[PDB]
Amino acid sequence: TTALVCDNGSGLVKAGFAGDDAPRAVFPSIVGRPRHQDSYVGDEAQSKRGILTLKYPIEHGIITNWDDMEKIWHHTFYNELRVAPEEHPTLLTEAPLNPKANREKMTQIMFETFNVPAMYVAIQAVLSLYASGRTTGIVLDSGDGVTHNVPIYEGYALPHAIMRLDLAGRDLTDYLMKILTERGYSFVTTAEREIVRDIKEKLCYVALDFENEMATAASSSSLEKSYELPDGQVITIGNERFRCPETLFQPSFIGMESAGIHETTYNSIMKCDIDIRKDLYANNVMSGGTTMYPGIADRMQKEITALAPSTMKIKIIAPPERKYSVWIGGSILASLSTFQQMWITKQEYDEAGPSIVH
Numbered sequence: 001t002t003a004l005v006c007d008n009g010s011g012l013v014k015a016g017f018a019g020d021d022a023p024r025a026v027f028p029s030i031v032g033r034p035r036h037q038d039s040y041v042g043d044e045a046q047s048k049r050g051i052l053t054l055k056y057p058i059e060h061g062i063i064t065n066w067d068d069m070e071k072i073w074h075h076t077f078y079n080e081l082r083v084a085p086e087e088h089p090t091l092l093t094e095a096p097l098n099p100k101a102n103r104e105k106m107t108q109i110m111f112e113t114f115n116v117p118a119m120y121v122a123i124q125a126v127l128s129l130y131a132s133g134r135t136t137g138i139v140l141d142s143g144d145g146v147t148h149n150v151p152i153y154e155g156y157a158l159p160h161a162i163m164r165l166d167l168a169g170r171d172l173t174d175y176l177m178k179i180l181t182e183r184g185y186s187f188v189t190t191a192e193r194e195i196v197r198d199i200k201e202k203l204c205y206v207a208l209d210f211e212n213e214m215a216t217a218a219s220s221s222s223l224e225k226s227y228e229l230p231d232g233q234v235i236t237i238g239n240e241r242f243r244c245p246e247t248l249f250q251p252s253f254i255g256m257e258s259a260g261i262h263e264t265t266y267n268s269i270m271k272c273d274i275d276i277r278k279d280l281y282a283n284n285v286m287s288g289g290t291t292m293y294p295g296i297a298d299r300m301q302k303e304i305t306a307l308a309p310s311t312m313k314i315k316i317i318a319p320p321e322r323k324y325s326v327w328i329g330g331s332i333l334a335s336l337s338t339f340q341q342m343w344i345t346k347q348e349y350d351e352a353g354p355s356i357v358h
């Protein structure tokens with residue numbers, strides 16, 4: 001019997017079968033409901049938005065509308081994976097610091113609505129660590145909705161040391177939209193937004209030294225790249241390429257007072273037992289789509305080096321497949337023979353209720 005793995009992202013659901021190397025299904029975490037006086041999920045919801053009301057049930061990584069989430073899961077099982085959920089153990093993911101009641105509700109829905117035979121809920125960043133071949137390290141997981149630093153020791157997250165940056169890929173897209181709009185290219189609508197998201201993913205990068213890179217862009221065309229818009233206009237960008245993701249290191253760029261991702265990484269390590277910090281510094285694993293920017297590992301290496309003790313060995317691991325590391329880690333975990341005893345079964349649920357999930 002094949003187990004399912006579903007990574008419930010703010011931006012994208014990644015779903016598939018345990019044992020596979022990649023998720024079979026990747027689609028936007030959007031539900032379209034009929035306008036009042038029949039529902040759609042993903043690309044089709046966006047396509048038909050003129051007759052629907054769009055819902056975003058995963059906000060900053062936390063599931064906030066259960067009826068809409070049920071529609072996403074229904075779509076995942078029946079339309080994307082083409083399975084009957086009552087026939088498959090199902091591993092779901094959750095954000096770091098997910099409230100206990102939320103995990104319990106996820107469990108209730110899986111058993112009572114979908115009648116899964118068994119299930120488990122794992123923390124996203126922990127799965128990404130496993131996908132890197134490690135059980136000790138500190139993960140920087142940055143997706144569409146939220147960014148976390150999650151230090152992990154001997155296979156388990158250390159919740160007291162988790163840090164959360166309330167900015168991720170959507171904010172970076174929005175910021176690039178603002179920058180390009182001010183330059184005379186109006187990007188405000190959803191169709192325009194998708195174009196800006198694509199520009200971001202294709203052309204943006206993280207500068208090793210932001211001030212140096214600004215100087216280069218001011219004095220040369222060497223950093224310029226062009227992009228043809230759907231209306232046939234060709235837009236050229238230079239410093240916008242690296243100003244956009246610089247926001248991860250300087251959240252003040254979008255008016256946030258927060259520490260940048262290098263600082264939150266360091267702060268997280270400093271909340272951990274002094275005896276494990278050496279191992280965390282040597283095992284900083286990057287996951288999620290917003291860690292895909294060229295240059296980000298080298299910048300992280302530089303910034304952590306500046307904050308850490310001078311003798312400290314620092315290593316950033318940024319796997320090529322890291323857009324899907326969470327899902328992959330779930331696939332690996334759910335495939336382990338020793339994990340099979342860890343599934344919560346429907347029998348156990350019937351006996352004990354949702355609280356069993358902790």
Ligand SMILES: Nc1ncnc2c1ncn2[C@@H]1O[C@H](COP(=O)(O)OP(=O)(O)OP(=O)(O)O)[C@@H](O)[C@H]1O
Pocket residue numbers: 008009010011012013060061142143144145146147168169170197200201202287288289290291292293323
């Ligand atoms: N090559 C790339 N460069 C920059 N950003 C990218 C790239 N590829 C994807 N992204 C961004 O990554 C985000 C999607 O990443 P991911 O699937 O990890 O997020 P998620 O799991 O849905 O969100 P979260 O974990 O925050 O709830 C989007 O904002 C997308 O634009």
Ligand SMILES: [Ca+2]
Pocket residue numbers: 008009010124143144288326
């Ligand atoms: Ca994610």
